[PDB]
């Protein structure tokens, strides 16, 4: 086959290769950075609220420490979305590092955002459903932080084996290929500077499968605490909205990243928008009812409404 | 009326008590004598060694 000969024939012309340059519309970079900074200011406002009000009963009935942990996680996600616009020159060694860093910050941030919510929901379920007059439910913030730490550990062990066993080799591949059908024959040639790892789909499937198991358990918990309390403390709607948005954004962003590497502005805009929308929506669903109910709770604590469940055993048709 | 029993109780006590009121020095002396007579048979006073201690063998 003359392929081996043309192999070495093109090797002489392969001495050089195309470099890289920034081509992200500044306006886009600007609008995105503004939105992300506003979201970070909202995060700072919510943490300030939380802290200041950590003694308010309702804030006290809403697990302020886990809200803090979720806020750190959201800050991590925002910083990763900031990093997705750093497609500039840097150097090959850093570009690999930049991509790996932003992906691992996004994964860690997702874990730190969703772990505390699941812990709060599980604790609320245990508190409101197990009603034993002498065996109390004793779950402290240390135990829920430990569960979140277990989630985080698992995530970093997966990221560590990803980076240490199969890193993101940014490589220059020049290739020509001819494809033939049963009756047709054609030829094509292409160049592609993609920063992907060998067996990338392995890592995507693994990471997003553990995340999917977590989301399935989160939906189960949200169903379990259906009408356990009021929205300030119930938080089941937050979990449902979050898991649906996460699934939609993950699918859309994956597809766009894989099939639109030639559209850098579109990929960057969609990625930043998806991250921002999911994180901000989750944070707002966490914190808005607290702000709403905070003012109506200083006068005098009689308006206690959270206590309200749903248990009956009627016969079935 | 019913309190009538307390005078008889107290007078019985009087005679019962002052029939013998040995000096508190004598009571102290016999107390120390009893304490020091049965010393070295009290396992708490002096720790018993593990060879004949039923709670560690």
């Amino acid at each position: 086959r003359p392929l081996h000969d043309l192999c070495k024939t093109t090797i002489t012309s392969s001495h050089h290769s195309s470099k890289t340059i920034s081509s992200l519309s500044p306006v886009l970079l600007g609008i995105v950075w503004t939105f992300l900074s506003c979201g970070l200011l909202l995060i700072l406002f919510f943490l300030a609220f939380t802290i200041h009000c950590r003694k308010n009963r309702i804030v006290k009935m809403s697990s302020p420490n886990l809200n803090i942990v979720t806020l750190l996680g959201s800050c991590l996600t925002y910083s990763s979305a900031y990093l997705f616009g750093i497609q500039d020159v840097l150097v090959g060694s850093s570009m690999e590092t930049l991509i790996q860093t932003r992906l691992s910050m996004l994964c860690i941030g997702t874990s730190l955002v969703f772990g505390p919510i699941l812990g709060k929901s599980w604790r609320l379920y245990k508190v409101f459903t197990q009603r034993v007059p002498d065996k109390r439910v004793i779950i402290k913030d240390l135990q829920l932080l430990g569960l979140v730490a277990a989630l985080l550990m698992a995530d970093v062990i997966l990221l560590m084996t990803w980076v240490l066993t199969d890193p993101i080799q940014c490589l220059q591949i020049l290739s020509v290929s001819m494809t033939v059908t049963g009756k047709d024959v054609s030829c094509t040639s292409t160049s592609t500077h993609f920063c992907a790892s060998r067996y990338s789909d392995v890592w995507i499937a693994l990471i997003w499968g553990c995340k999917g198991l977590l989301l399935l358990y989160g939906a189960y918990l949200a169903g379990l605490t259906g009408h356990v309390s009021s929205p300030p403390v119930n938080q089941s709607l937050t979990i449902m909205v979050g898991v649906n948005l996460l699934v939609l954004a993950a699918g859309l962003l994956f597809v766009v990243t894989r099939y639109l590497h030639s559209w850098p502005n579109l990929v960057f805009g969609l990625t930043s928008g998806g991250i921002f929308v999911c994180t901000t929506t989750i944070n707002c669903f966490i914190f808005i009812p607290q702000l709403k109910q905070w003012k109506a709770f200083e006068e005098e604590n009689q308006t206690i409404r959270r206590m309200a469940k749903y248990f009956s055993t009627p016969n079935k048709s | 009326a019913s309190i009538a029993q307390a005078r008889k109780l107290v007078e019985q006590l009087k005679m019962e008590a002052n029939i013998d009121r040995i000096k508190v020095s004598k009571a102290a002396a016999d107390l120390m004598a009893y304490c020091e007579a049965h010393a070295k048979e009290d396992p708490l006073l002096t720790p018993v060694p593990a060879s004949e201690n039923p709670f560690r063998e």
Binding site: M61, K126, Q130, V132, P133, V137, M307 | -
Partner: protein
């Protein structure tokens, strides 16, 4: 050492029965029933039953309730009140008809006796975290008496009119003012009558609230 193994096996059997009847015992609601005599304690225990120390049992919505009446103890309350420290709630019965009634054993409203007993029980060192279910009995009899005998006979500082729904509310807040641990315990007031209106249901709701709040306090959420 074979009989020793048999003894160890018997001991392990005994620990097993202990675990079963302990976890079974943890599921029952313990209620200490207090209050002055002839104030409705007999009537109250009557509807809860029909659904030394006298102990009553009754079930309602699965929950199993044990109610201990200690009204027959003429001894010093301080010496045994450290028992019942673990009861889930205290049931206190007060007869609203006692407002214009002095007390055998005078110038003492049977009403101020209820107050003093409630003050001692509510602010006791052993019950700092135990909620109280306050039952005010004899609604109809009291509301009949209030139409010709003013509440001023009992409360010289009272200013409202001689109508029950205002006087009964006034007595309700007066008994709740005696609570000096508002930040750690709660008082569930309820008006009843000779007829069982909602008594068992009210107790069930109060106890369920107490259990939920105890769970919340243990986790640090309330």
């Amino acid at each position: 050492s074979a009989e020793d193994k048999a003894a160890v096996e018997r001991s392990k059997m005994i620990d097993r029965n202990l675990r079963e009847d302990g976890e079974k015992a943890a599921k029952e609601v313990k209620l200490l029933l207090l209050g002055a005599g002839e104030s409705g304690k007999n009537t109250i225990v009557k509807q809860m039953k029909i659904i030394g120390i006298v102990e009553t049992h009754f079930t309602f919505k699965d929950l199993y309730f044990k109610m201990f009446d200690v009204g027959a103890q003429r001894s010093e309350r301080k010496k045994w009140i450290h028992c019942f420290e673990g009861v889930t709630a205290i049931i206190f019965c007060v007869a609203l008809s006692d407002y214009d009634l002095v007390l055998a054993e005078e110038e003492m409203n049977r009403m101020h006796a209820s107050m003093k007993l409630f003050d001692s029980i509510c602010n006791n060192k052993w019950f700092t975290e135990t909620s109280i279910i306050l039952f005010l009995n004899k609604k109809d009899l009291f509301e009949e008496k209030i139409k010709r005998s003013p509440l001023t006979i009992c409360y010289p500082e009272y200013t409202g009119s001689n109508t029950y729904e205002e006087a009964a509310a006034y007595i309700q807040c007066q008994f709740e003012d005696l609570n000096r641990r508002k930040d750690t315990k709660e008082i569930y007031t309820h008006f009843t009558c000779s007829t069982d209106t909602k008594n068992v249901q009210f107790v069930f709701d109060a106890v369920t609230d107490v259990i939920i709040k105890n769970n919340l306090k243990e986790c640090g959420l309330y």
